[PDB]
């Protein structure tokens, strides 16, 4: 909600309360999404200032607060700054922002990140370009310098984050993307390569001096319809865990496919049919292994901009015989949302 | 403070800064409330939306920020989401909300949780129903479907939270409550039973396949007077610690009594006289043990809705000879509050 | 930004997004400021209420959110409440506030804490009086009871914080300060003494039953000019680490000197020339050791109250041969700020 606007500075303070539960049999140690309470809160600010006519300065910070911890010691778990950045919109020339942000690859995969609860499984955190990373300078251009309508690109720069964990680390990298949006239709291309950290390289799973993530996208956003498809391929790039031998690291190569079909009904209900499969070719010890394999049945009922309840249900195509030992049970997710 | 209201959505953003100190002799390792700096901050949102005339959607998130940590490593301690939920108010039919929230039992014990600083000692966090728990679906009804004025109930559903700690865990449970409020007078009844987690059952202290919490309440809220009484009984339900043998778990049974007397003076000062005693019958190794035993002398001076300073002083009726080894010294608490 | 004002209560909700990077060679394990992503967010409230004409109640809470963590486990690092307090402004008689706050000494050292990114190196957290501490009651007086224009003092009371760490701990103490501000010119005096905690005393580095911090200040705030000088001396007061023998504690004595020269250009750019040197006399094992020794070249470009980018560059006068083993390389800092 816009809670400030004077002298050309406008500040939006927004949040939500998403009382949420997940439903699976057993512990759900072996289901897709887990089992039990999953409630969370968000709060953040989109700020924006006009420096002149030709110039606009902005900044954003969003934070995940978890509602499923006891007020004791586990009190802090899964709390995080999801976004924190700042930039300058120059008239027609462009827009530059540094901070923690979505990587250029997400300019593509984002398409199929539209399910009520789940979906967007290839969009990992601190996975170079496919999700939200820290230390990303991005230059984005709208309408090719204002000359070609709906033709947009972005060129991104990733800054070596050497962390205590290989999963969360990353080296120096570069990336880009181009999307063209002719009349409800949008097709996206996106690519990023990165140096790997020496800790990532001294992993058991994964082999290369370089991680790579590229994805193509297609969508139809019109007439209350959402159709979207995604094809991606990660090289030494997606993170994985042998749950049997308790081993960690990266998949040498992945081919990933995500498809979403959604229609928005007038009265509110937004039914959702989707599919997601990621598979890792040539993993060490195991060969070819599925990570994510499921069909999606779900419906968000919107009451207005602020209120909604959703049912999201992942029919898991993973068989119990999983070689990386992923979950094979189904996960039903039910939620009630107040956003502002 | 209400910081947004347009198009039928109203958002309240509220917080406080409570510079607070506690006063006890020695380390106060043996006093009632501790000793030293106790300053904290709160921030949260009560949001509310009108879906139509007959329908209202809401959500809340409140967060405890601690002010007594050094900016180093201890920086995060005692930080927590206290509330995070969402629900639907249907006209006269009712109101349903899931999330982290106060348990139905608190519909009773709440009465005597009115002291400036202390009091409400039987209202534990993640203690099933007596305080704030995670994963509670609640259906509350006002005025018995709008037919009997001031006659209210609630039926609650608790969702198995299997956690790393027995103190913080809990299984599947159900609860309810009825309160009737005839002219300043209010009498409450409240009951909840729950399955226990296998970790809770493999505790040294406590024995049963089930925890139980019921409490009765009475109050007089009128003429600047607050009188309230509470009688409760927890079965395998209240948590406790043998500080001698460093043992943990639950009291087999507790009888708990809380009484508050308060008058509000015109100019501002709200003097407060109160008493609280919890005792655990049939604890393992120890027999009958007092947990909380004290008298309360205190006064909140209110300047307005936003400003206040309070003195709260707990004369501790625990004798030094305590068999669970509780604190026996008095604790003086002084505070200065800016809320909004 | 002021987001609430009705019925005499005014509430400011303010924050920022500071996408920030630091530039150093090697790991920068040996540079002045580190190397890599350094983005952070802040959010807090300055609230204020009028109790009558003669009386004003206030409260503040500010919080540091870090933007450079992966969304995993390192997710929480360097998060902290920086301020959390409350107080009463009585007409001409004065103003009293308890909570977590800047210590009276900071009433002096504050002067040279004006660099774009760095500077103010002697202003440590939970270092008694020189920075932000927890459990400080402060009485501040403006214009000597409204009788001598621009003549101000403060008398402060520090409350024993016995913590898990000596670095972060502190005992019972008292402090004060007087500053007089004749026409752009301001000269400050400030002093504080404190009992030391037994854990601090059982440190290898440092010797005394008492820590002391006093600092003098001078400034010229006029005509778009900022000149300021600081002289300080800490006794058993500044914290330090032998990185060779991995030893911790306090410098027996420090003399500290900070100087800032800044001019504000009309169009926006604020160039900044500065210097900072702290040295510890009579440290155990080592003798005399420099802690901070550098020159400061930098420029904040302001677009308006909300937008800015800065370059800050510390030419490090520490030679590689450091006896406490401090960093000796230079650190370039680049940042982009949205505040509100
Ligand atoms: C206030 C608020 O946050 N409301 C809200 C409700 C339901 C939502 C979202 C917001 O979307 C953001 C979800 O945050 C998860 C990060 O986004 C993401 C990244 C990678 C893969 C999948 C992701 O989204 C999950 C589902 O988002 C769709 C709607 O969920
Ligand atoms: C902004 C703000 O929080 N102001 C404030 C000042 C003084 C208060 C309260 C709020 O009440 C909420 C206190 O939070 C503790 C949770 O409530 C609770 C649970 C169980 C037992 C006792 C409890 O309250 C402690 C005292 O509350 C009375 C007024 O305190
Ligand atoms: C919204 C926001 O916080 N904006 C902002 C941008 C740049 C800044 C500051 C704020 O100043 C506050 C910096 O916080 C650090 C605490 O202050 C401090 C203490 C001790 C020594 C040095 C300090 O300041 C560092 C630089 O501050 C100057 C401007 O930085």
3-state secondary structure B281-338: EEECCCEEEEEEEEEEEEEEEECCCCEEEEEEEEEECCCCCCCCCCCCECEEEEEEEE
What residue has token string 């000062």?
A: B269
Q: Which residue in chain B is spatially nearest to C99 when comparing CA positions?
A: B19
Q: In angstroms, what is the span from residue B113 Cα to ligand 2's centroid?
A: 8
Find, among B28, B248, B210, the residue nearest to B128 by Cα: B210
Environment class of C170 (CB within 10 Å of its CB; exposed 0-12, middle 13-18, buried 19+): buried
CA distance A279 to A265: 34
What residue has token string 């000019």?
A: C225
Find, among C87, C98, C201, C175, the residue nearest to B68 by Cα: C98
CA distance B274 to B42: 26
B145: left (phi over 0), alpha (psi -120 to 50) or beta: left
- Find the helix or strand (DSSP H, E) in which C312 lies: strand C307-316
Is A192 strand, coil or helix? strand
In sign, the C-alpha dihedral spanning B248, B249, B254, B258 is positive
Radius of gyration of chain B (CA): 20
A263 CB-near residues (< 8 Å, 6+ apart): A224, A225, A226, A270, A271
- Least distant ligand from the CA of C19: 3
Residue pair C80/C65 in contact by the 8 Å Cβ criterion: no
Instruction: Return the structure tokens found at C229.
Output: 């000088």
Angle, CA B303 vertex, CA B297 and CA B305 arms, to 5°: 100
**C137 touches A: beta carbon within 8 Å:** no
**B13 touches C: beta carbon within 8 Å:** yes
CA distance A185 to A222: 8
Output phi, psi for B210, to 5 deg.
-165, 140
Resolution of the structure in the document, Å = 3.4
Whole-angstrom CA distances from C109 to C102, C123, C170, C232 are 11, 7, 20, 8
CB-based contact C66 A81, cutoff 8 Å: yes
CA distance A19 to A17: 6
Residue pair B315/B285 in contact by the 8 Å Cβ criterion: no
* Chain B positions in Cβ-Cβ contact with residue C170 (cut-off 8 Å): none
Range A245-283 burial, b when 16+ CB lie within 10 A, else e: eebbbbbbbbebbbbbbbeeeeebebbbebbbbbbbeeb
CA distance A332 to A328: 13
CB-based contact C39 A162, cutoff 8 Å: no
CA distance C107 to C124: 13
CA distance C270 to C332: 17
| For the CA of A340, the nearest atom of ligand 1 | 1
Q: In angstroms, what is the span from residue B17 Cα to ligand 3's centroid?
A: 21
Is A311's C-beta closer than 6 angstroms to any atom of ligand 1?
no
- Which one of C1, C15, C45 makes the best mutation probe of the B interface by having the most chain B beta carbons within 10 Å? C45
C63 CB-near residues (< 8 Å, 6+ apart): B41, B65, C42, C43, C44, C79, C80, C81, C82
Output phi, psi for C106, to 5 deg.
-50, -20
CB-closest option in A51, A98, A167 to C336 = A98
Q: Which domains does chain C have, with CATH numbers?
A: 1-340 (2.40.160.10)
**A161 touches C: beta carbon within 8 Å:** yes
Output phi, psi for A272, to 5 deg.
-140, 115
**C84 touches A: beta carbon within 8 Å:** no
Environment class of A313 (CB within 10 Å of its CB; exposed 0-12, middle 13-18, buried 19+): buried
CA distance C108 to C100: 18
Residue C224: CB atoms within 10 Å: 11
CA distance C228 to C6: 40
CB-based contact C125 B72, cutoff 8 Å: yes
Is A285 strand, coil or helix? coil
Instruction: Return the structure tokens found at A112.
Output: 């199929």
DSSP-derived pairing of the beta strands A270-283 and A287-302? antiparallel
* Chain B positions in Cβ-Cβ contact with residue A72 (cut-off 8 Å): 125-126, 165, 167-168
Instruction: Return the structure tokens found at A8.
Output: 């050309």
DSSP state string for B119-166: --TT--TTSTTSSEEESEEEEEESHHHHTSTTEEEEEEEE--B--S-T
Q: In angstroms, what is the span from residue C240 Cα to ligand 3's centroid?
A: 22
DSSP-derived secondary structure letter, B196: P
Residue C267: CB atoms within 10 Å: 7
Range C1-30 burial, b when 16+ CB lie within 10 A, else e: bebbeeeebbbbbbbbbbbbbbbbeeebeb
Find, among C167, C13, C275, C333, the residue nearest to B69 by Cα: C167
Cα diameter, chain A? 62
Instruction: Please name the method used to determine this structure.
Output: X-ray
Residue pair A62/A31 in contact by the 8 Å Cβ criterion: no
Taking one residue from A and the other from B, the number of pairs with CB-CB distance under 8 angstroms is 152
* Chain C positions in Cβ-Cβ contact with residue A4 (cut-off 8 Å): 1-3, 340
CB-closest option in B65, B72, B338 to C86 = B338
Chain A contact partners (≥3 CB pairs within 8 A): B, C
| Through-space distance between the first and last CA atoms of chain A, rounded to whole angstroms | 6
CA distance A62 to B294: 44
B245 CB-near residues (< 8 Å, 6+ apart): B285
Residue pair B107/B179 in contact by the 8 Å Cβ criterion: yes
CB-based contact B47 A17, cutoff 8 Å: yes
DSSP-derived secondary structure letter, C149: T
C267 CB-near residues (< 8 Å, 6+ apart): none
CB-based contact A57 C17, cutoff 8 Å: no
CA distance A114 to A116: 7
């Amino acid at each position: 909600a816009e809670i400030y606007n004077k002298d050309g500075n406008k500040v939006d303070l927004y949040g939500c309360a998403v009382g949420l539960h997940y439903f699976s049999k057993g512990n759900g140690e072996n289901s897709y999404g887990g089992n039990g309470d999953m409630t969370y809160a968000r709060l953040g600010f989109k700020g924006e200032t006009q420096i002149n006519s030709d110039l606009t300065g902005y900044g954003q910070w969003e934070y995940n607060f978890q509602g499923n911890n006891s007020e004791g010691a586990d009190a802090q778990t899964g709390n995080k700054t999801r976004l924190a950045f700042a930039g300058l919109k120059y008239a027609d020339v462009g827009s530059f922002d540094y901070g923690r942000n979505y990587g250029v690859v997400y300019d593509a995969l984002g398409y199929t990140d539209m399910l009520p609860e789940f979906g967007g499984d290839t969009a990992y955190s601190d996975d170079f370009f496919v999700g939200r990373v820290g230390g990303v300078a991005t230059y984005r251009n709208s309408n090719f310098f204002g000359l070609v309508d709906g033709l947009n690109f972005a060129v991104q720069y990733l800054g070596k984050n050497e962390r205590d964990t290989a999963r969360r680390s990353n080296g120096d990298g570069v990336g880009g993307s181009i999307s063209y949006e002719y009349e409800g239709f949008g097709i996206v291309g996106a690519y990023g390569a990165a140096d790997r950290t020496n800790l990532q390289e001294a992993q058991p799973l994964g082999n290369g001096k370089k991680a790579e993530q590229w994805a193509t996208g297609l969508k139809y956003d019109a007439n209350n319809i959402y159709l979207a498809a995604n094809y991606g391929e990660t090289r030494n790039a997606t993170p994985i865990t042998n749950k049997f031998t308790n081993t960690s690291g990266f998949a040498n190569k992945t081919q990933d496919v995500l498809l979403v079909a959604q229609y928005q009904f007038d009265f509110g209900l937004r039914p959702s049919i989707a599919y997601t499969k990621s598979k890792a070719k040539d993993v060490e010890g195991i060969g070819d292994v599925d990570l994510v394999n499921y069909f999606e049945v779900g419906a968000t009922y919107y009451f207005n901009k602020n209120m909604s309840t959703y049912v999201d249900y992942i029919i898991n195509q993973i068989d119990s015989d999983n070689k990386l030992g992923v979950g094979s049970d189904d996960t039903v997710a039910v939620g009630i949302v107040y956003q502002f």
